[PDB]
Amino acid sequence: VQIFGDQVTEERAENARLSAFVGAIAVGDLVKSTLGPKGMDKLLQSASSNTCMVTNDGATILKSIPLDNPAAKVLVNISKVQDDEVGDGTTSVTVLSAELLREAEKLIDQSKIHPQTIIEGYRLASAAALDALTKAAVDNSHDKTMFREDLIHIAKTTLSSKILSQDKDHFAELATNAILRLKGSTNLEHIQIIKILGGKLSDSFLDEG
Amino acid sequence: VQIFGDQVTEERAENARLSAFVGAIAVGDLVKSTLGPKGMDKLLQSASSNTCMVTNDGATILKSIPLDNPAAKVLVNISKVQDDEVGDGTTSVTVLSAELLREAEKLIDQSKIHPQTIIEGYRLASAAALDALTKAAVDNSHDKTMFREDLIHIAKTTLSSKILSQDKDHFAELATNAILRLKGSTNLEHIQIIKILGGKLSDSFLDEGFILAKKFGNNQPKRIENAKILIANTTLDTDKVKIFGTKFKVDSTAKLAQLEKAEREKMKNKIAKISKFGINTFINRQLIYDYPEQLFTDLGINSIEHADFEGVERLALVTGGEVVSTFDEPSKCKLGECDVIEEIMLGEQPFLKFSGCKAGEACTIVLRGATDQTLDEAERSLHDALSVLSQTTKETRTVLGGGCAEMVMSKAVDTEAQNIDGKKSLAVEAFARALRQLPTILADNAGFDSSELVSKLRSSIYNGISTSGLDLNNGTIADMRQLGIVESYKLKRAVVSSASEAAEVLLRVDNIIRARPR
Amino acid sequence: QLFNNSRSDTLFLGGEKISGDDIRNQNVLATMAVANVVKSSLGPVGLDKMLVDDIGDFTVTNDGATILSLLDVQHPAG
Amino acid sequence: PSNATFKNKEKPQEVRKANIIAARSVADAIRTSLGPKGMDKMI
Amino acid sequence: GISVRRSGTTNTYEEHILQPVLVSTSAITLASECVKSILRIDDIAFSR
Ligand SMILES: Nc1ncnc2c1ncn2[C@@H]1O[C@H](COP(=O)(O)OP(=O)(O)O)[C@@H](O)[C@H]1O
Ligand SMILES: Nc1ncnc2c1ncn2[C@@H]1O[C@H](COP(=O)(O)OP(=O)(O)O)[C@@H](O)[C@H]1O
Ligand code: BEF
Ligand code: BEF
Numbered sequence: 001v002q003i004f005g006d007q008v009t010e011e012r013a014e015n016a017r018l019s020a021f022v023g024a025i026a027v028g029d030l031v032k033s034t035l036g037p038k039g040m041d042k043l044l045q046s047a048s049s050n051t052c053m054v055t056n057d058g059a060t061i062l063k064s065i066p067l068d069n070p071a072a073k074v075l076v077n078i079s080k081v082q083d084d085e086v087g088d089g090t091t092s093v094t095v096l097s098a099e100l101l102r103e104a105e106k107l108i109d110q111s112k113i114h115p116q117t118i119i120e121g122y123r124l125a126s127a128a129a130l131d132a133l134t135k136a137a138v139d140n141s142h143d144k145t146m147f148r149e150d151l152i153h154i155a156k157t158t159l160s161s162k163i164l165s166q167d168k169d170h171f172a173e174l175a176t177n178a179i180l181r182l183k184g185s186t187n188l189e190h191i192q193i194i195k196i197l198g199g200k201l202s203d204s205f206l207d208e209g
Numbered sequence: 210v211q212i213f214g215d216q217v218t219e220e221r222a223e224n225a226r227l228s229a230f231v232g233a234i235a236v237g238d239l240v241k242s243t244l245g246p247k248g249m250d251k252l253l254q255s256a257s258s259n260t261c262m263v264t265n266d267g268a269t270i271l272k273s274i275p276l277d278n279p280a281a282k283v284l285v286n287i288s289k290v291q292d293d294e295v296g297d298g299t300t301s302v303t304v305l306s307a308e309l310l311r312e313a314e315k316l317i318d319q320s321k322i323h324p325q326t327i328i329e330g331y332r333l334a335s336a337a338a339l340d341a342l343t344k345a346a347v348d349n350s351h352d353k354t355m356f357r358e359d360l361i362h363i364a365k366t367t368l369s370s371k372i373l374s375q376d377k378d379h380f381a382e383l384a385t386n387a388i389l390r391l392k393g394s395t396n397l398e399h400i401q402i403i404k405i406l407g408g409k410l411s412d413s414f415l416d417e418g419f420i421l422a423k424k425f426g427n428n429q430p431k432r433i434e435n436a437k438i439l440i441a442n443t444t445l446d447t448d449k450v451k452i453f454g455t456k457f458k459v460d461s462t463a464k465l466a467q468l469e470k471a472e473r474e475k476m477k478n479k480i481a482k483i484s485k486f487g488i489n490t491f492i493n494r495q496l497i498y499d500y501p502e503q504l505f506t507d508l509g510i511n512s513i514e515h516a517d518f519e520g521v522e523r524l525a526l527v528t529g530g531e532v533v534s535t536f537d538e539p540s541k542c543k544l545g546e547c548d549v550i551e552e553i554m555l556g557e558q559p560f561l562k563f564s565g566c567k568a569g570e571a572c573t574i575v576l577r578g579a580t581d582q583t584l585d586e587a588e589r590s591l592h593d594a595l596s597v598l599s600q601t602t603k604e605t606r607t608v609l610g611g612g613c614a615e616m617v618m619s620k621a622v623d624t625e626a627q628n629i630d631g632k633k634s635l636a637v638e639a640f641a642r643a644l645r646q647l648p649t650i651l652a653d654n655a656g657f658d659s660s661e662l663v664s665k666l667r668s669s670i671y672n673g674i675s676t677s678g679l680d681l682n683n684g685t686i687a688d689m690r691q692l693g694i695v696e697s698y699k700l701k702r703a704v705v706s707s708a709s710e711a712a713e714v715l716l717r718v719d720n721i722i723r724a725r726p727r
Numbered sequence: 728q729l730f731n732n733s734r735s736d737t738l739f740l741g742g743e744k745i746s747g748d749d750i751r752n753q754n755v756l757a758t759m760a761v762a763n764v765v766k767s768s769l770g771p772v773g774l775d776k777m778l779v780d781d782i783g784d785f786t787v788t789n790d791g792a793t794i795l796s797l798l799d800v801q802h803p804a805g
Numbered sequence: 806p807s808n809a810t811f812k813n814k815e816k817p818q819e820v821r822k823a824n825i826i827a828a829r830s831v832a833d834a835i836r837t838s839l840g841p842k843g844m845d846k847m848i
Numbered sequence: 849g850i851s852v853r854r855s856g857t858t859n860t861y862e863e864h865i866l867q868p869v870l871v872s873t874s875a876i877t878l879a880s881e882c883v884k885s886i887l888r889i890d891d892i893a894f895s896r
């Protein structure tokens with residue numbers, strides 16, 4: 001006795017777990033090469049427009065490529081969310097997101113443990129991972145001298161994995177100066193990003209005015 | 210720049226490994242439920258014929274289902290090999306075959322270790338798992354008393370996972386009696402497996418003698434007592450002719466009548482040549498012509514027609530007779546004798562049951578049951594039993610099953626890893642981990658915490674209680690010697706051997722190339 | 728007499744099954760079909776029928792069994 | 806024992822269930838043809 | 849048991865309504881045995 005209408009798909013327990021994992025992993029594994037300093041870039045291309053783009057920003061990959069696996073699209077959005085709430089950590093979110101789910105399938109199959117028990121266990125750990133994080137945190141006080149050098153670093157770190165790795169130092173002061181300049185506003189419309197084709201990359205600048 | 214023809218597939222390294230793994234693991238993950246006491250059966254059904262089969266025999270599943278993935282078709286064959294070389298261990302081979310490859314992807318990806326180096330480690334483990342197998346082997350010597358109770362166990366262990374689980378003790382004694390009766394002969398043709406529908410499963414039996422799927426020569430006596438038998442291959446209905454081309458050219462009809470009666474005389478004489486043998490029972494592979502059929506009846510000789518190269522060979526072994534032709538000099542050839550050949554009924558069909566024979570060296574087991582599939586399986590289950598027990602007549606050493614056998618190797622392979630060191634070391638431990646993954650599913654199908662139980666049995670065997678095995682009804686660690694869960698060495702020695710080979714073949718693969726289908 | 732639906736549990740091949748009332752009535756309807764054709768041909772006041780081969784060729788008869796032989800009958804109960 | 810041992814794959818549970826149904830249907834086609842008040846079938 | 853003629857509760861052995869032991873001995877045994885081989889099934893897969 002068939003229940004649903006036609007063209008309708010039912011992926012239940014045993015098969016719904018597969019999809020959920022196959023999806024997440026397949027997406028996590030796609031951006032894995034983006035991660036870190038000696039990380040690599042993807043070349044995405046549309047069928048539409050005869051357009052393409054060569055990118056690192058892990059969101060920009062995930063946001064772009066088409067997908068069907070709903071579980072995948074979940075992670076894809078968690079990617080945009082991060083790009084919204086912080087701007088960086090796009091690929092760091094997705095990989096850690098998939099690597100949790102990889103590690104679940106290895107528990108759900110090999111061992112045979114309840115998914116809800118895994119949850120009530122992934123939960124205790126998360127609150128403890130975020131715990132030590134604040135204990136190990138290095139908050140930088142009134143010393144704006146000690147904090148600018150501190151900022152320049154964060155950028156230098158962020159930047160190394162893009163084409164801008166080689167001119168890290170250069171682009172780090174162009175960001176640090178621009179943001180300090182911004183005087184504590186957190187809206188980025190205030191920094192107009194005008195790209196004009198030609199010359200070196202080391203030829204890029206923040207104008208005084 | 211394209212190289213190949215159209216509809217040609219090239220799966221290279223990165224993707225070839227995917228096929229290799231996904232293909233094997235898929236096949237392994239298909240038969241995993243077959244393994245063990247509290248294991249379950251598959252229902253195979255062909256699109257052709259409207260036929261099906263309800264099976265456990267892992268080979269019968271894999272040999273049946275069609276597949277595309279070459280890496281899968283590899284393990285499919287190694288399953289046939291095991292069924293050819295041992296008869297049992299079809300599923301065990303494939304699962305251990307896959308679990309090794311499962312533990313390879315986990316190394317190739319998660320660890321980044323060269324496949325040739327995993328091969329060069331799997332190799333070091335495989336010769337050490339086969340090592341501690343022989344050391345843990347229990348060979349049974351002259352005490353045929355000790356060896357019979359040993360063989361029965363083998364059957365009891367082999368049978369519990371098939372329908373015959375509930376009737377283990379009964380079928381074990383039916384197999385043990387049949388192989389011991391076979392007098393060492395390692396040919397299974399000698400055991401005729403006649404399946405007739407109806408009644409219970411407890412109702413199956415091995416006949417003391419032989420039952421023949423044939424009839425008597427016509428209006429002949431239904432039950433012969435104090436038999437003496439001639440077994441024959443010579444022609445009867447065909448009318449024996451000198452091969453070449455003997456064409457009659459009769460000048461005038463008159464000589465045709467004589468030459469017609471001549472062929473009758475050639476027969477009458479060829480039956481008289483047999484009459485001189487002094488025998489009340491004549492069995493012949495060939496047909497008995499409507500004429501000779503009577504010539505035996507008038508003389509009182511019972512004549513049975515159509516029991517081929519098969520039937521005749523068994524009769525010669527059970528009656529102690531000879532597969533005779535010529536019949537020119539009766540003194541030199543050896544007759545067959547038995548006590549009574551009375552024609553019984555079994556549900557519907559009329560079988561002639563030879564009872565009380567001269568030498569029991571060929572037998573017939575009659576299987577019974579409620580369903581044509583139940584019978585199918587009983588035969589397939591039984592072949593698995595008449596294989597281990599028949600091959601342990603040749604290879605007389607034993608190893609304790611219930612996961613114990615595979616654990617004792619998991620021990621030695623795991624300590625040799627604490628000896629080898631390097632990046633190979635990891636692949637050596639992995640081999641051990643894969644061997645552990647067998648008792649894991651034995652436990653998973655029954656229902657208890659696979660994690661806890663395997664982890665409980667590891668501790669014991671590793672601690673030196675190298676008898677400890679899985680009690681798969683009580684969910685505990687139990688003594689395998691004292692609970693009689695014994696298996697063939699030749700079985701376990703093949704399983705590890707066969708599987709280790711599968712692994713190296715596939716782990717060497719890095720390019721899958723498919724040509725346009727026919 | 729709305730065309731009956733094939734059951735959603737039972738699985739039969741190149742074959743349909745009508746049960747109870749639906750068949751009991753079908754039988755009777757197909758039985759009257761065959762009988763009513765030859766009710767006109769009964770009695771001395773009865774009349775004859777003209778049966779075309781389809782190629783024009785034909786036969787005229789009263790003999791009921793010869794009429795019923797000629798009519799192509801499709802139903803079992805017919 | 807709140808964590809327990811999780812039953813992983815579900816096809817078993819639903820195949821048994823759907824076999825019985827497929828079978829009970831045949832046994833149901835026959836119920837009309839049992840005993841002296843039982844009715845015959847035309848095939 | 850049920851007697852069709854009586855339409856109710858009546859002594860069926862005396863009513864001469866009689867069936868062989870084998871017809872019931874085998875009836876239950878086969879059914880119960882078949883169920884055992886139906887419940888063995890945990891998957892169907894289509895073969896070549
Ligand atoms: N120069 C560096 N040396 C060591 N680690 C670095 C360096 N630059 C970045 N990282 C690390 O690499 C990660 C940043 O990689 P990236 O591809 O930008 O991912 P995301 O987009 O998720 O931030 C961070 O985890 C950071 O700790
Ligand atoms: N009664 C039992 N108790 C515990 N383990 C058993 C029992 N019978 C068999 N086994 C184990 O289960 C395995 C047999 O499973 P089976 O499904 O027959 O696989 P295969 O087809 O490969 O022989 C053997 O390796 C043996 O160790
Ligand atoms: F690849 Be990222 F958003 F530093
Ligand atoms: F599945 Be087996 F050959 F006992």
Ligand SMILES: [Mg+2]
Nearest residue numbers: 088089090158
């Ligand atoms: Mg980053």
